[PDB]
Every structure is written in C-alpha cells, then in structure tokens.
C-alpha cells in the first residue's frame, strides 16, 4: 500500500470538484498559444488544470504546498493578465476558496499522508535544523537595523514595477514559511534563498543603494551565524541525509 497514490488521488478529486464549479472553463486547458499569441510572453510560469492533473498523476506534488502553490499561480496569472479585480481572477479565486475548504475538511488525513510520504517532517533532527534556521532569521537577520523592507513580500501596490523587474522574489517571511514547511535539508538551499535577497536588491536598487547595504548586512550576519553553528549543523545535515536515504529504503521497497 502506497501513500503517494492516496495523496495524488485526493488532489485529483479536488481538481475534479473545481472543474465542476460554475464558470471555471477558461482555465481547464493550456492557453492555446496559437490563438492568443502573446500569452506566455506576459505570464512566465503558465499553468492550467490539465497540466496540474498531469503533474498530480506523475506524482510531482508530495504535499499540500507544491500543489497549492501551482494552483495559486493560476490566480496570480489571471490577476496579472486580466487584472486584479477581473471577474475571471475572482473565479480563479473561487476555486482556490473551495480548495482551501477541502484541505481544511480533510486536514488530519492529509497530515497523516504527508508524514508517511516524507518522514523527515517528523525527524527530530530535521525539526531542530529548521528551528535553528528560524532563529537565525528572527534573532539575527530581522534584527538588522532598518531591515523592515525585507520582512515581507513586496506589495505591488507600493512598488508598482517590482515584479516586472524581479522574477525570483524573496523575503524573510517567505523563508520562514519555507522553514516551517522544512524545505531546507541543508545550508546550501537556505543560502540560495538568502543570497537571492541580496542579488535582488542589487538588481532593483543598484549596487550602491541603502537597500543593498542593509541586504549585505542581513546576508553577512546570516553567514556569520552559520559559521558559528558549523559543527552542529554539519552533524544535523548528516543525520538528515541518512534519514532521507532510509526513506527510500523503506519507501520503494513497498512499491514491490
Ligand atoms: C523583498 C524585499 C524587497 C526590498 N525592498 C522593499 C521596498 C518597500 C516595500 C514596501 C512593501 O511592499 N511593504 C512594506 C513591508 O511589508 C510588505 C509591504 C514598502 C516600502 C518599500 N520602500 C518604502 N516603502 C514604504 C522597496 C522600495 C524600493 N526598493 C525596495 C526594496 O528593495
């Protein structure tokens, strides 16, 4: 018995429910780029319900968040293309609302499957690694003076052109959300996102901007603290690696 099939089937059942909701049809299939010739030129990350279903069946989504993140892309894309208040964006939001409803109704089962699919989400070493990361963000990085601009995602309302320039946005709240979801099994991925903050400030504000001087201070204090914790983190990453390999040993052995 394989929990990924059960999970994928739950998501597929939700896709079916959203397709059956009223007025959702313009999103059921990929945009026909041969009729609407500029579509993939405005939206960079196309998404639709057929490709989403195809990804669910290829088992690419091991948890609520990857599926929901791809689902939420549809709404952001309509908001971008149709406008933030277009009825279509409102209809894509109506499907997301039903989705949030189903995830809420079935949340205990979903938790059980998500943990069976990926046991690291219960590994005392993964949780501790994530806890340490969270403290670096809150106790060191968010304490940099005048670091408030990086605490939350940019609101396009206040910086109207930001996301036309920055295609890989990042912020400290998003990283914390990622930590809470245990996205990071090691310092490499964590630092990829951390360094992305500094790179983005350089691009949008310029190398000599005060925003970038603050971002340099944020990254520097992140590295200083990682260096201070090197030996414990190396041990945690090692135990995480071993748990991850055993979660294959005991995962695919069952598919037979
Ligand atoms: C991911 C980090 C990008 C860093 N960043 C931020 C801003 C910035 C963001 C927001 C904003 O959207 N806010 C507030 C914080 O909470 C969410 C809502 C508001 C702002 C801002 N500057 C003045 N105000 C009033 C800005 C402006 C010019 N360059 C930048 C810049 O590089």
Swiss-Prot record:
Subcellular location: Nucleus
Post-translational modification: Phosphorylated by casein kinase II in vitro.
Domain Bromo: 1-106, 120-229
Family from the record: Belongs to the TAF1 family.
Domain-level remarks: The Bromo domain mediates interaction with histones that have acetylated lysine residues at specific positions. The second domain also recognizes and binds histones that are butyrylated and crotonylated.
Subunit note: Component of the TFIID basal transcription factor complex, composed of TATA-box-binding protein TBP, and a number of TBP-associated factors (TAFs), including TAF1, TAF2, TAF3, TAF4, TAF5, TAF6, TAF7, TAF8, TAF9, TAF10, TAF11, TAF12 and TAF13. Interacts with TAF7; the interaction is direct. TAF1, when part of the TFIID complex, interacts with C-terminus of TP53.
Disease: Dystonia 3, torsion, X-linked: An X-linked dystonia-parkinsonism disorder. Dystonia is defined by the presence of sustained involuntary muscle contractions, often leading to abnormal postures. DYT3 is characterized by severe progressive torsion dystonia followed by parkinsonism. It has a well-defined pathology of extensive neuronal loss and mosaic gliosis in the striatum (caudate nucleus and putamen) which appears to resemble that in Huntington disease.
The name this protein goes by in its record: Transcription initiation factor TFIID subunit 1
Organism: Homo sapiens
Gene: TAF1
Positions spanned in the full protein: 1400 to 1655 of 1893
